[PDB]
Amino acid sequence: SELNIYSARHYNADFEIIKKFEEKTGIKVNHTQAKASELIKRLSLEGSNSPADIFITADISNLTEAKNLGLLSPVSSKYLEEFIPAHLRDKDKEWFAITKRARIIAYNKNTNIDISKMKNYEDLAKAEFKGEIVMRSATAPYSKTLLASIIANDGNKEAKAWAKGVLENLATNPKGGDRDQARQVFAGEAKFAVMNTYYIGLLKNSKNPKDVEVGNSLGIIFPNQDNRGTHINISGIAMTKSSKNQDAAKKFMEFMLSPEIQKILTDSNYEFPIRNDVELSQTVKDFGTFKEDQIPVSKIAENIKEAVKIYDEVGFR
């Protein structure tokens, strides 16, 4: 009858998906969108009394934070286990990926720009790029999880040095999110933006012609192709321990991995599907092929607390 979703996703495509669920099942969805940090705090304070049934994020670490705050409940679904690879879901069955996305370095391909020395995440922190980089706030999930991945791969001293150098190199204080950083590259205010791949698709296919202009100017560097490969993060989903509509919650989680919905996620939101039998949308194919970091996303997320402290220490936020 009702299903209460707390979502840190921030996409128009989700509205269509939810309508399709309502149409299919007759269940009314109450959709609450806010920042992940706000939702996790809210879930903690509301506790067992929360009306929430579902927590959706655009980030692995937010799911693990929620798990480790005792806020989620395990789901044993043959459907989810068949179609989500084990490396993309919790061993303890409390969180499950619905998409993949890659955090890349974007440049203005309508300029002559030498990208030969901007090859790895490490390079963003190099003195030669002072004043040439833009990135959103350190408090953003994408930023926290990227730094956590650097800790996991290269250690906490490289992480701190990276964070410090990135801060020093920013063309501007962080101003809005990925699409705003992309506009700064379009406008020539910075040479390189740290951003997720799907935003390039959203922009290029936008019904707002100004978004199309921005998206059309972007080239992609997939970082670290000569070594470990590019940072992958997930959007994902969990049932809350507070859930009183558990059947609906499980139905919704399975619906997010259904063929039609995985196709919408790539066709309409330009993300990578989790299912291995869903063709990429043509825009996403145009991003190109690339090497992905093989690290389990769960292992990245083990470093989230320290990532927060490092960004705080070097002077973000």
CB environment 257-292: b (16+ within 10 A), e (fewer): bbeebbbbbbbbbbbbbbbeebebbebbeebeebee
Cα 4 from Cα 210, distance rounded (Å): 35
**Of 231, 217, 219, nearest to 114 (Cα)?**
219
Among all chains, which residue has been given the structure tokens 């992958």?
A: 232
Q: Nearest distance from residue 10's CB to Fe ion, in Å?
A: 6
Q: Which is nearer to Fe ion, 17 or 125 (CB)?
A: 17
Q: Which is nearer to Fe ion, 58 or 200 (CB)?
A: 58
**Contact of 107 with 221, CB cutoff 8 Å:** yes
Q: Nearest distance from residue 58's CB to Fe ion, in Å?
A: 5
Provide the Cα torsion 190, 36, 85, 68; round to 10°.
130
Q: Which is nearer to Fe ion, 75 or 105 (CB)?
A: 105
Q: Which is nearer to Fe ion, 51 or 177 (CB)?
A: 177
Q: Which residue number is nearest to Fe ion in terms of Cβ?
A: 58
Q: Which is nearer to Fe ion, 195 or 308 (CB)?
A: 195
Q: Nearest distance from residue 253's CB to Fe ion, in Å?
A: 20
**Contact of 171 with 117, CB cutoff 8 Å:** no
Q: Nearest distance from residue 11's CB to Fe ion, in Å?
A: 7
| Residue 270, annotated as binding a ligand | no
Q: Nearest distance from residue 182's CB to Fe ion, in Å?
A: 12
Site residues (vs Fe ion, CB under 5 A): 58
| Residue 311, annotated as binding a ligand | no
Return the amino acid letter for 67: K
| Residue 10, annotated as binding a ligand | yes
Nearby residues of 36 by Cβ (< 8 Å), 6 or more positions away? 8, 57, 58, 59, 62, 141
Cα 70 from Cα 122, distance rounded (Å): 35
| Residue 199, annotated as binding a ligand | yes
Binding-site residue positions for Fe(3+): 10-11, 142, 198-199
Binding-site residue positions for Fe cation: 10, 198-199
Binding-site residue positions: 10-11, 142, 198-199
